[PDB]
Write a protein that binds this ligand. Structure first.
Ligand SMILES: CC(C)=CCC/C(C)=C/CC/C(C)=C/CC/C(C)=C/COP(=O)(O)OP(=O)(O)O
Ligand SMILES: CC(C)=CCC/C(C)=C/CC/C(C)=C/CC/C(C)=C/COP(=O)(O)OP(=O)(O)O
Ligand SMILES: [Mg+2]
Ligand SMILES: [Mg+2]
Ligand SMILES: [Mg+2]
Ligand SMILES: [Mg+2]
Lengths: 312, 314
């Protein structure tokens, strides 16, 4: 009687979800929102909108979509990379646990997917925005997948610089392209697509990220992670090309230690500085990429300041 | 200059991805594919199609979408639940690592999303299909979120039976409704919606999953997990209501040990058998839910099915 009646009412209604339940699942996400950098991504979307011209509130939704995807991808990335810190603050999984952090990050990817339907009610356009969203999230995961595979199967595969760049086009290029492609699709206005420029921005951003992780130290957490970062990939291929067997193996040994020992981390930085000159090689490489934009007098890529502060 | 030429070529082309790359990152997923269950899920989809009549090619895609979703959900649930085994086999994260397993499962959620486009060439219907897919994946994550939070922050929140059933309507009900709603949306045909029946199947499935995890032991891994299972929720509320302070606290202590000790697990199960009578309560609750369908002569919930209902665990 009463039990069957309560069951019948339950199965005939939509699943129950409260604002309190929403606050509970949002805790790991709210924690990363404390991290700085929002001002900066906001600025890049604003500046690109000088070309695209989306109306303010449509731009607001693109921005929210991008923020959810970026933050969620970093919450998961930190679990994948066993990262203890992100922008100087403790990572969410060390506070709320890996289980809630993964579930919340995933939930926010689906909340971002839902916000796409609010960019437009035109069916054909909507289909195109969801396809952009789906394609670039697929690319991001393919790229992350390779980054993780090389790291976790090392020394099975040592990537070449070309392989690394293709991984970055997928991994870091994904959200850069997603944000821009959504904006170019919604533009009510503009010229050649800016996807090439934004691919270049993504490459520069990732090589700089990998470089600064080591250069600031010289926490160099990337060494503890065992990551096949741009300078590491240069150093492994360089020692291999030169027949520098012992040095090649010592770089591999230190990466495989997954060490937090400052003195050992410093020894790998010494190899990269004195033996392969990989940090200077990387500095020069980022400069060359940046100059491709600085000297784009014919605006083949462009439609300064952002590019220089790209790391934040 | 050759550097510029190469960078220019790279940024002017789609990102490079090979079939070898695809194979290497699919490892965690290929491994769970070795587990049984596929035939059973295909059987429930087949029976419901006797009502929905989708053409075979189209039913095949629905089935592929749901399978990718189901499998990716389990890869991730096992990481969340620190599970060593799934269907008698070692779980993927123990073999390939949590990093690859999480990324591959999430990749497969997006591959499933991609497959929705192959169900129709009509934009208005497509939007509906994507909405269904999005809504039920949101529900699944909301339910999973409560299940995890209650367990990992215990005793912050002791859920009631009512709370547990709402978490299940979200968690377990999510994929059952996703499959059924995609089918009802694509039907070219068929009576009242089967959503209420599918919600009941989800609840029966989950409470039976919880019950059997303890009754086949009586490896009771749910105790090691610390899960707020249907019998554990009944025991915790029964003890509080009855003033069994020590037993209420002992249930919490055992759940918090995250123990693999078989005798500590058996002590808890026997507290549920004899002190709170949670096992009998759960068996009876399951039977009552199943009878709501077996005694549905007017076909108010119902549109073979009964066979699936008794083998729902598979
Ligand atoms: C293009 C426009 C208009 C705006 C940009 C909008 C966004 C979201 C920019 C940021 C995109 C971004 C930085 C994506 C990469 C996120 C990712 C997958 C990180 C994980 O890779 P790691 O190499 O582990 O990164 P960390 O070094 O931070 O741990
Ligand atoms: C409705 C039709 C036609 C078919 C059904 C098709 C499917 C996919 C059925 C199964 C759906 C199902 C059982 C989903 C639950 C997946 C999930 C979120 C599991 C995680 O929860 P736990 O409670 O940890 O489960 P375990 O006990 O298996 O670890
Ligand atoms: Mg990282
Ligand atoms: Mg990473
Ligand atoms: Mg589980
Ligand atoms: Mg679970």
């Amino acid at each position: 009687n009463k039990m069957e009646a309560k069951i019948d009412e339950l199965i005939n209604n939509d699943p129950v979800w409260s604002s309190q339940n929403e606050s509970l699942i949002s805790k790991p996400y709210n924690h990363i929102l404390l991290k700085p950098g929002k001002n900066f991504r906001l600025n890049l979307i604003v500046q690109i909108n000088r070309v695209m011209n989306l109306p303010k509130d449509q731009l607001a939704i693109v921005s929210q979509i991008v923020e959810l995807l970026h933050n969620s991808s970093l919450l998961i990335d930190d679990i994948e990379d066993n990262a203890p810190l992100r922008r100087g603050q403790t990572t969410s999984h060390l506070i709320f646990g890996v289980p809630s952090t993964i579930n919340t990050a995933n939930y926010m990817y689906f909340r971002a997917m839902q916000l796409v339907s609010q960019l437009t009610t035109k069916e054909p356009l909507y289909h195109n925005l969801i396809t952009i969203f789906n394609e670039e999230l697929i690319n991001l995961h393919r790229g992350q997948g390779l980054d993780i595979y090389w790291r976790d199967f090392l020394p099975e595969i040592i990537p070449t610089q070309e392989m690394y760049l293709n991984m970055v086009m997928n991994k870091t290029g994904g959200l850069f392209r997603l944000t821009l492609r959504l904006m170019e699709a919604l533009s009510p206005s503009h010229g050649h697509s800016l996807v090439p420029f934004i691919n270049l921005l993504g490459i520069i951003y990732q090589i700089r990220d990998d470089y600064l992780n080591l250069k600031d130290f010289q926490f160099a957490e990337d060494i503890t992670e065992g990551k096949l970062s741009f300078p590491i990939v240069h150093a492994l291929n360089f020692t291999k090309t030169k027949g520098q067997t012992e040095q090649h193996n010592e770089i591999l040994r230190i990466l495989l230690l997954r060490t937090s020992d400052k003195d050992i981390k410093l020894k790998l930085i010494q190899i990269l500085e004195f033996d392969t000159n990989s940090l200077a090689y990387t500095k020069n490489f980022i400069n060359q990429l940046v100059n491709m934009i600085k000297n784009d007098n014919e605006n083949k890529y462009l439609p300064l300041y952002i590019i220089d502060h790209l790391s934040e």
